[PDB]
Design a protein around this ligand. Structure first.
Ligand SMILES: O=c1ccn([C@@H]2O[C@H](COP(=O)(O)OP(=O)(O)O[C@H]3O[C@H](CO)[C@H](O)[C@H](O)[C@H]3O)[C@@H](O)[C@H]2O)c(=O)[nH]1
Ligand SMILES: [Mn+2]
Length: 242
Protein backbone atom coordinates (compact mmCIF):
# COMPACT_ATOMS: atom_id res chain seq x y z
CA UNK A 1 0.00 0.00 0.00
CA UNK A 2 3.12 2.19 0.27
CA UNK A 3 2.02 4.41 3.18
CA UNK A 4 4.62 6.78 4.65
CA UNK A 5 5.18 6.69 8.42
CA UNK A 6 6.81 9.26 10.72
CA UNK A 7 10.17 8.18 12.17
CA UNK A 8 11.68 9.33 15.47
CA UNK A 9 15.39 9.81 16.14
CA UNK A 10 15.63 9.07 19.84
CA UNK A 11 18.61 11.21 20.88
CA UNK A 12 20.22 10.24 24.20
CA UNK A 13 23.05 12.52 25.36
CA UNK A 14 25.31 10.24 27.29
CA UNK A 15 28.43 9.86 29.40
CA UNK A 16 29.15 7.25 32.07
CA UNK A 17 25.56 5.92 32.33
CA UNK A 18 25.93 2.34 31.07
CA UNK A 19 23.81 0.83 33.84
CA UNK A 20 21.02 3.30 33.05
CA UNK A 21 21.31 2.55 29.33
CA UNK A 22 20.82 -1.18 29.88
CA UNK A 23 17.45 -0.45 31.48
CA UNK A 24 16.58 2.33 29.05
CA UNK A 25 16.91 0.35 25.81
CA UNK A 26 14.54 -2.58 26.48
CA UNK A 27 12.01 -0.35 28.25
CA UNK A 28 11.74 2.28 25.52
CA UNK A 29 11.77 -0.32 22.74
CA UNK A 30 8.84 -2.25 24.23
CA UNK A 31 7.00 0.96 25.15
CA UNK A 32 7.32 2.44 21.67
CA UNK A 33 6.49 -0.82 19.87
CA UNK A 34 3.20 -0.93 21.78
CA UNK A 35 2.14 2.39 20.25
CA UNK A 36 3.66 1.59 16.88
CA UNK A 37 6.24 4.39 16.89
CA UNK A 38 9.00 3.77 14.36
CA UNK A 39 12.29 4.97 15.85
CA UNK A 40 15.99 4.40 16.45
CA UNK A 41 18.06 5.11 19.56
CA UNK A 42 21.19 7.20 19.10
CA UNK A 43 23.52 7.23 22.10
CA UNK A 44 25.46 10.49 21.99
CA UNK A 45 28.59 9.55 23.92
CA UNK A 46 30.74 12.53 24.92
CA UNK A 47 34.35 11.37 24.76
CA UNK A 48 36.25 14.64 25.17
CA UNK A 49 37.25 15.46 28.77
CA UNK A 50 35.26 18.67 29.09
CA UNK A 51 32.22 19.01 31.34
CA UNK A 52 29.01 17.31 30.18
CA UNK A 53 27.30 19.34 27.41
CA UNK A 54 24.02 17.60 26.58
CA UNK A 55 22.78 20.38 24.29
CA UNK A 56 25.83 20.34 22.02
CA UNK A 57 25.62 16.54 21.91
CA UNK A 58 21.98 16.81 20.80
CA UNK A 59 23.02 19.21 18.01
CA UNK A 60 25.62 16.67 16.90
CA UNK A 61 23.11 13.81 17.01
CA UNK A 62 20.68 15.89 15.00
CA UNK A 63 23.26 16.48 12.26
CA UNK A 64 24.23 12.81 12.14
CA UNK A 65 20.74 11.29 12.11
CA UNK A 66 19.44 10.62 8.59
CA UNK A 67 16.83 12.98 7.04
CA UNK A 68 14.44 10.03 7.10
CA UNK A 69 13.87 10.77 10.80
CA UNK A 70 11.37 13.61 10.56
CA UNK A 71 11.29 14.28 14.30
CA UNK A 72 13.55 13.81 17.31
CA UNK A 73 13.02 12.97 20.95
CA UNK A 74 15.58 14.61 23.24
CA UNK A 75 15.57 12.06 26.04
CA UNK A 76 17.29 11.65 29.43
CA UNK A 77 18.59 8.10 29.83
CA UNK A 78 17.24 7.74 33.40
CA UNK A 79 13.65 8.83 32.80
CA UNK A 80 11.19 6.11 31.78
CA UNK A 81 7.46 6.56 30.96
CA UNK A 82 5.14 4.32 32.99
CA UNK A 83 1.91 5.35 31.25
CA UNK A 84 1.07 4.10 27.74
CA UNK A 85 -1.12 7.19 27.15
CA UNK A 86 2.05 9.26 26.77
CA UNK A 87 2.10 9.29 22.98
CA UNK A 88 5.54 9.85 21.40
CA UNK A 89 3.78 11.08 18.28
CA UNK A 90 4.81 13.41 15.45
CA UNK A 91 4.39 16.88 16.97
CA UNK A 92 1.71 19.24 15.60
CA UNK A 93 2.32 22.47 13.70
CA UNK A 94 2.14 24.33 17.04
CA UNK A 95 5.67 23.34 18.07
CA UNK A 96 7.50 20.84 20.31
CA UNK A 97 5.62 18.09 22.16
CA UNK A 98 6.79 17.95 25.77
CA UNK A 99 6.19 14.49 27.21
CA UNK A 100 7.58 15.02 30.72
CA UNK A 101 5.39 17.96 31.75
CA UNK A 102 5.78 19.69 35.13
CA UNK A 103 2.45 18.19 36.29
CA UNK A 104 3.81 14.70 35.54
CA UNK A 105 7.53 14.93 36.27
CA UNK A 106 8.64 13.52 39.66
CA UNK A 107 10.90 16.48 40.46
CA UNK A 108 10.60 19.50 38.17
CA UNK A 109 7.29 21.31 38.45
CA UNK A 110 7.84 24.85 37.19
CA UNK A 111 5.50 26.02 34.41
CA UNK A 112 8.05 26.32 31.61
CA UNK A 113 10.05 23.20 32.37
CA UNK A 114 10.63 21.45 29.04
CA UNK A 115 13.30 18.95 30.06
CA UNK A 116 13.52 15.19 30.42
CA UNK A 117 11.66 14.18 27.24
CA UNK A 118 11.01 16.72 24.48
CA UNK A 119 9.88 15.90 20.94
CA UNK A 120 10.65 18.31 18.09
CA UNK A 121 10.03 18.26 14.34
CA UNK A 122 13.18 18.29 12.24
CA UNK A 123 11.92 21.52 10.62
CA UNK A 124 11.22 23.25 13.93
CA UNK A 125 14.61 22.27 15.35
CA UNK A 126 16.29 23.57 12.19
CA UNK A 127 14.23 26.76 12.35
CA UNK A 128 15.45 27.37 15.91
CA UNK A 129 19.11 26.66 15.02
CA UNK A 130 18.91 23.77 17.50
CA UNK A 131 20.14 24.22 21.06
CA UNK A 132 22.67 26.65 22.49
CA UNK A 133 26.26 25.37 22.74
CA UNK A 134 27.21 27.41 25.79
CA UNK A 135 25.93 25.01 28.45
CA UNK A 136 28.76 22.97 29.99
CA UNK A 137 27.81 21.14 33.19
CA UNK A 138 24.30 20.76 34.64
CA UNK A 139 21.38 23.09 34.03
CA UNK A 140 19.69 25.87 32.05
CA UNK A 141 20.13 24.51 28.50
CA UNK A 142 16.48 23.46 28.16
CA UNK A 143 15.28 26.71 29.68
CA UNK A 144 17.18 28.69 27.06
CA UNK A 145 15.70 26.35 24.44
CA UNK A 146 12.24 27.25 25.78
CA UNK A 147 12.97 30.86 24.83
CA UNK A 148 14.12 29.71 21.38
CA UNK A 149 10.72 28.03 20.99
CA UNK A 150 8.92 31.30 21.74
CA UNK A 151 11.27 33.44 19.62
CA UNK A 152 10.50 31.15 16.69
CA UNK A 153 6.82 31.91 17.22
CA UNK A 154 6.16 28.32 18.32
CA UNK A 155 4.47 26.86 21.44
CA UNK A 156 4.94 23.87 23.70
CA UNK A 157 2.14 21.29 23.68
CA UNK A 158 1.73 18.58 26.30
CA UNK A 159 -0.46 15.45 26.56
CA UNK A 160 -3.90 16.33 27.95
CA UNK A 161 -6.22 14.12 30.02
CA UNK A 162 -3.32 12.16 31.54
CA UNK A 163 -4.69 10.75 34.80
CA UNK A 164 -1.46 9.79 36.57
CA UNK A 165 0.55 12.44 38.38
CA UNK A 166 4.01 13.36 39.63
CA UNK A 167 4.43 10.15 41.62
CA UNK A 168 3.36 7.57 39.05
CA UNK A 169 3.86 8.90 35.49
CA UNK A 170 7.64 8.39 35.19
CA UNK A 171 10.40 6.38 36.78
CA UNK A 172 13.30 8.75 37.49
CA UNK A 173 15.99 6.50 38.88
CA UNK A 174 18.68 9.06 39.58
CA UNK A 175 20.22 9.19 43.04
CA UNK A 176 21.87 12.61 43.50
CA UNK A 177 24.93 11.12 45.22
CA UNK A 178 25.35 8.24 42.79
CA UNK A 179 25.08 10.33 39.63
CA UNK A 180 26.13 13.81 40.75
CA UNK A 181 24.84 16.93 39.04
CA UNK A 182 27.81 19.03 37.91
CA UNK A 183 26.63 22.38 39.29
CA UNK A 184 30.05 23.99 39.64
CA UNK A 185 30.42 27.54 38.34
CA UNK A 186 33.72 29.13 37.30
CA UNK A 187 34.87 32.12 35.29
CA UNK A 188 31.70 34.07 34.54
CA UNK A 189 29.50 31.04 33.92
CA UNK A 190 26.57 32.18 36.08
CA UNK A 191 26.21 35.53 34.35
CA UNK A 192 26.72 34.21 30.83
CA UNK A 193 24.63 31.03 30.82
CA UNK A 194 21.67 32.98 32.22
CA UNK A 195 21.62 35.15 29.08
CA UNK A 196 19.75 34.13 25.92
CA UNK A 197 22.32 32.90 23.38
CA UNK A 198 21.75 34.29 19.88
CA UNK A 199 25.25 33.40 18.67
CA UNK A 200 25.61 29.62 18.86
CA UNK A 201 23.59 26.59 17.89
CA UNK A 202 23.22 23.79 15.40
CA UNK A 203 24.94 25.77 12.66
CA UNK A 204 28.23 26.28 14.52
CA UNK A 205 28.67 23.43 17.01
CA UNK A 206 32.32 22.36 16.81
CA UNK A 207 33.05 18.63 17.08
CA UNK A 208 34.39 15.43 15.58
CA UNK A 209 32.72 12.06 15.59
CA UNK A 210 35.69 9.79 16.31
CA UNK A 211 33.79 6.54 15.93
CA UNK A 212 30.35 5.11 15.18
CA UNK A 213 29.51 1.79 16.88
CA UNK A 214 26.61 -0.49 15.95
CA UNK A 215 25.41 -2.13 19.16
CA UNK A 216 22.78 -4.79 19.84
CA UNK A 217 21.34 -5.07 23.32
CA UNK A 218 19.30 -8.26 23.58
CA UNK A 219 18.60 -8.06 19.83
CA UNK A 220 17.70 -4.34 19.88
CA UNK A 221 19.94 -2.28 17.55
CA UNK A 222 21.34 0.96 18.98
CA UNK A 223 23.83 3.42 17.44
CA UNK A 224 26.67 4.85 19.56
CA UNK A 225 28.33 8.08 18.42
CA UNK A 226 31.63 8.79 20.13
CA UNK A 227 31.61 12.58 20.08
CA UNK A 228 34.65 14.76 20.73
CA UNK A 229 33.32 18.24 21.58
CA UNK A 230 35.63 21.20 21.11
CA UNK A 231 35.73 24.03 23.63
CA UNK A 232 36.80 27.58 22.83
CA UNK A 233 38.14 28.80 26.16
CA UNK A 234 38.13 32.35 24.81
CA UNK A 235 34.31 32.07 24.79
CA UNK A 236 33.20 29.36 27.23
CA UNK A 237 36.11 28.64 29.61
CA UNK A 238 33.65 27.11 32.10
CA UNK A 239 33.79 23.97 29.93
CA UNK A 240 36.48 23.01 32.46
CA UNK A 241 36.74 24.40 36.00
CA UNK A 242 39.70 22.19 36.98
O1 LIG B 1 27.37 13.12 33.45
C1 LIG B 1 26.14 12.97 32.77
C2 LIG B 1 25.10 13.91 32.99
C3 LIG B 1 23.90 13.71 32.27
N1 LIG B 1 23.79 12.67 31.43
C4 LIG B 1 22.62 12.52 30.71
O2 LIG B 1 21.87 13.76 30.75
C5 LIG B 1 20.57 13.42 31.32
C6 LIG B 1 20.06 14.58 32.17
O3 LIG B 1 21.03 14.91 33.15
P1 LIG B 1 20.68 14.67 34.70
O4 LIG B 1 19.86 13.38 34.84
O5 LIG B 1 21.97 14.60 35.47
O6 LIG B 1 19.88 15.96 35.26
P2 LIG B 1 18.37 16.10 35.72
O7 LIG B 1 17.93 14.79 36.40
O8 LIG B 1 18.32 17.29 36.66
O9 LIG B 1 17.49 16.34 34.39
C7 LIG B 1 16.94 17.62 34.05
O10 LIG B 1 17.98 18.66 34.14
C8 LIG B 1 19.07 18.75 33.02
C9 LIG B 1 19.63 20.01 32.96
O11 LIG B 1 20.81 19.97 32.43
C10 LIG B 1 18.32 18.42 31.65
O12 LIG B 1 17.63 19.60 31.24
C11 LIG B 1 17.36 17.30 31.74
O13 LIG B 1 16.69 17.10 30.42
C12 LIG B 1 16.35 17.54 32.73
O14 LIG B 1 15.36 16.37 32.73
C13 LIG B 1 20.78 12.19 32.12
O15 LIG B 1 19.56 11.51 32.38
C14 LIG B 1 21.67 11.43 31.22
O16 LIG B 1 20.98 10.91 30.12
C15 LIG B 1 24.82 11.82 31.24
O17 LIG B 1 24.70 10.90 30.47
N2 LIG B 1 25.95 11.96 31.90
MN1 LIG C 1 18.12 12.70 36.03
Amino acid sequence: DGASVHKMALLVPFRDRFEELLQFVPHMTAFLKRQGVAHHIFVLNQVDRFRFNRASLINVGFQFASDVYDYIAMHDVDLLPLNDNLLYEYPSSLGPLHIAGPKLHPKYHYDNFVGGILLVRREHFKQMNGMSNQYWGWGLENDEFFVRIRDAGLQVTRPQNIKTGTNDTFSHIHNRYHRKRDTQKCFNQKEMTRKRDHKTGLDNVKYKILKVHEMLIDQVPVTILNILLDCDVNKTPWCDCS
